[PDB]
Design an enzyme around this catalytic site. Structure first.
Site, PDB file in Angstrom:
ATOM      1  N   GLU A 149       0.812  -1.171   0.000  1.00  0.00           N
ATOM      2  CA  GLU A 149       0.000   0.000   0.000  1.00  0.00           C
ATOM      3  C   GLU A 149       0.856   1.235   0.000  1.00  0.00           C
ATOM      4  O   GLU A 149       0.685   2.102  -0.852  1.00  0.00           O
ATOM      5  CB  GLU A 149      -0.854   0.028   1.220  1.00  0.00           C
ATOM      6  CG  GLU A 149      -1.958  -0.992   1.263  1.00  0.00           C
ATOM      7  CD  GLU A 149      -2.759  -0.863   2.559  1.00  0.00           C
ATOM      8  OE1 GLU A 149      -2.379  -1.463   3.575  1.00  0.00           O
ATOM      9  OE2 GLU A 149      -3.771  -0.117   2.561  1.00  0.00           O
ATOM     10  N   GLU A 150       1.771   1.357   0.972  1.00  0.00           N
ATOM     11  CA  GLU A 150       2.656   2.519   1.107  1.00  0.00           C
ATOM     12  C   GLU A 150       3.352   2.848  -0.234  1.00  0.00           C
ATOM     13  O   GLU A 150       3.411   4.016  -0.658  1.00  0.00           O
ATOM     14  CB  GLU A 150       3.676   2.204   2.206  1.00  0.00           C
ATOM     15  CG  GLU A 150       4.497   3.407   2.598  1.00  0.00           C
ATOM     16  CD  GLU A 150       5.411   3.168   3.748  1.00  0.00           C
ATOM     17  OE1 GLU A 150       5.435   2.066   4.299  1.00  0.00           O
ATOM     18  OE2 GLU A 150       6.113   4.126   4.091  1.00  0.00           O
ATOM     19  N   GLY A 151       3.826   1.833  -0.940  1.00  0.00           N
ATOM     20  CA  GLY A 151       4.462   2.063  -2.216  1.00  0.00           C
ATOM     21  C   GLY A 151       3.520   2.542  -3.282  1.00  0.00           C
ATOM     22  O   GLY A 151       3.732   3.596  -3.883  1.00  0.00           O
TER      23      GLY A 151
END
Ligand SMILES: [Cl-]
Ligand SMILES: [Cl-]
Ligand SMILES: [Cl-]
Ligand SMILES: [Cl-]
Ligand SMILES: [Cl-]
Ligand SMILES: [Cl-]
Ligand SMILES: [Cl-]
Ligand SMILES: [Cl-]
Ligand SMILES: [Cl-]
Ligand SMILES: [Cl-]
Ligand code: NA
Lengths: 396, 399
Positions: free
Chosen positions: B121-123
């Site tokens: 998600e963060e990426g």
């Protein structure tokens, strides 16, 4: 009513097709129905003749169209997953691997089934799926799980839930969801450490420019002889670190049947000198402490079963292997006249390798040795990755 | 008319609160940085969480009109700092999440959850942010490079859509088109955790409580408490029994010994793929332009100010770091008297670290180096994951 799925396991040795069947899913189990072993080598051997893949896969594909009711065919998924033999071919040439895989898709797609794809699965997937297969068939997904040991021609996998999960090497952890219960396994695939690539490493390591084109080898029976092509030997990325200029194109392996010298020679392809972790397997790879019981399968089972049928502890298995190693090759072929010489000629080496791998590589010494259970089938389904792969692909 | 939403980015080094506002048209209205460390530093101090969030939340209540506060959603997405705490203790992590939730819930907005978001998600979301801000969504897209204290992410669309490791792949449709994006987060390879790995790797029973370290300026000292060093999962692999409870790092400022010492925390010896990043992780061949943000931008921005204020080749970026690393610690403070010492003290290490991660880690070698754009804001809005997160969790990304 009932449903069908086809999985091709394209390993470095053979391609095997599996047909699975299960009751059509109801708000009110998958089992192996049939297996076919494709005649020939692994698919990476087709790299320069992909025009032949279709023919290669035909006998087993026909079995499948003869076997699954025609009505049921259009809704039956077919997937091919390739493993380390194909990871090696890809390291050699991405484009060959791709041409192999495209020829497989075109072949498979030409059938009545629902083509789900032809991929090279990852080492972690391969190991995780194997653990899924064996714990699913052992009823464990209803507590503690069995670890999974897989040996093939080109790689070997170890997968298990460890006592305490760590960030030590988080590219060795895999988490996934199985029936509301989420699991963190340690899993590693050791490329080049399947039994056949290990032998190539050993031969490349030990061949001498000195030798006149002879290599005496304690890992083969007294009087065993086999000629090896130096171009085949060095045709795998696994022996690159050992390449030398040899003044001959080809050499004869001459067996000397000595288990402890065999054992010693095998240990030389393992590196135990660098470990940037608390503890390691070999070649600086993290391994947590062993935990629980293990199922060992594929070549682990086919090789150990052969020795067990001759007889069951570590001491006892070492003793049987040492004795067998020293039997002359003519005696061995005469005592086991029904065994394909391509498997028979390897049992001394493979048995000593399995023992080295489990006992020195993974430290299943002493007390832990009994924690390993060698398994072929559970409730009539092969232990392997394909079953778990089919459960996943079934969205299960 | 006009709508708001709030997203707190609870990262390892700081929590940053962002107010977005909208009728590529969503916009950062304001950012508030929370004073103090990251939320995981509150594991045993969870009663202090409310006071910690107070100033940035009072800011948002002042900024958003009361007429609009109740329909404004508020989210906390925590990243690798809290992933590490959830490892040390799921109980701790969850207590922090509970103290954060109680506090945010007390405000007049639409409380929508505090959770630890995944590395994917963060990426993916950082990649969404930069391409939405760049209007690359109206063609080629930019790759996204994120560095924080505890992890680092690389996200981009590879030439080949069939990845060799599909657990590194996501496929979505955005604004009419299909994308396969490669993304990976390397936990423990944020700039602060890398430093701890390195110091844990380098301290010896022999050290007798003094570690001379080339990644710090001549004259620099820093005390490291061994049970704090060994209190992160990132150092567990290097733990040893030591006969001192703390040690003093003493700077020797030599860039090239710093570089070597750094390389030693990355394992690059086995790769079952065509090419890897490090530690056996697959990386496709790099393609196209990249925006490098968060700690990549703040560190590099410092160094490019010594380079005629442009990011030069790797040669010159390297030369600049080499020279900087040798300056005594009194000289460096005298030269940059307006930079907080807690940042300035880390720059030789952080710059050497970023060059290694980019060049040897992510294979940005040579020709590919010039395709990295270090950016802080695009069009007045921070490059980061929080805007992308918002665009989806408010589903404002059309297919
Ligand atoms: Cl193969
Ligand atoms: Cl294999
Ligand atoms: Cl093989
Ligand atoms: Cl451990
Ligand atoms: Cl027989
Ligand atoms: Cl944190
Ligand atoms: Cl971070
Ligand atoms: Cl950190
Ligand atoms: Cl000084
Ligand atoms: Cl200044
Ligand atoms: Na690399």
């Amino acid at each position: 009513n009932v449903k069908y799925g086809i999985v091709l396991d394209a390993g470095s040795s053979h391609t095997n097709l599996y047909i699975y069947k299960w009751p059509a899913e109801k708000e009110n189990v998958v089992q192996q129905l049939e297996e076919c072993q494709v005649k020939g080598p692994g698919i990476s051997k087709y790299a320069q003749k992909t025009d032949e893949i279709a023919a290669y896969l035909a006998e087993c594909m026909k079995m499948s169209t003869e076997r699954i009711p025609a009505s049921k065919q259009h809704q039956t998924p077919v997937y091919l997953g390739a493993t380390a033999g194909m990871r090696l071919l890809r390291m050699e040439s991405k484009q060959s691997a791709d041409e192999v895989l495209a020829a497989v898709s075109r072949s498979l797609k030409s059938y009545p089934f629902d083509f789900q794809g032809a991929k090279i699965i990852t080492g972690q997937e391969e190991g995780a799926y194997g653990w899924i297969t064996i714990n699913y068939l052992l009823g464990r997904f209803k507590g503690s799980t069995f670890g999974a040991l897989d040996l093939g021609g080109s790689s070997t996998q170890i997968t298990f839930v460890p006592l305490n999960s760590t960030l030590e090497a988080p590219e060795t952890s895999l988490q996934f969801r199985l029936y509301g219960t989420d699991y963190t396994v340690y899993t590693h695939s050791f490329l080049c450490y399947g039994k056949d690539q290990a032998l190539w490493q050993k031969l490349a390591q030990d061949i001498q420019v000195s030798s006149g084109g002879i290599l005496k080898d304690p890992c083969f029976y007294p009087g065993y002889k086999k000629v090896v092509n130096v171009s085949e030997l060095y045709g795998t990325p696994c022996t690159k670190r050992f390449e030398k200029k040899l003044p001959f194109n080809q050499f004869q392996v001459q067996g000397t049947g000595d288990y402890e010298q065999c054992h010693q020679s095998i240990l030389k392809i393992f590196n135990n000198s660098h470990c940037p972790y608390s503890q390691c397997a070999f070649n600086g790879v993290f391994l947590p402490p062993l935990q629980g019981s293990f199922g060992a399968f594929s070549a682990f089972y086919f090789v150990m079963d052969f020795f067990k049928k001759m007889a069951s502890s570590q001491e006892k298995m070492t003793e049987i292997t040492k004795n067998f190693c020293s039997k002359p090759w003519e005696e061995v072929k005469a005592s086991y006249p029904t065994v394909k010489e391509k498997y028979l000629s390897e049992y001394c080496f493979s048995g000593t390798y399995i023992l080295s791998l489990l006992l020195q590589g993974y430290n299943f010494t002493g007390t832990s040795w009994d924690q390993i259970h060698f398994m072929g089938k559970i409730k009539d389904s092969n232990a392997g990755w394909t079953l778990g792969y089919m459960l996943n692909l079934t969205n299960m």
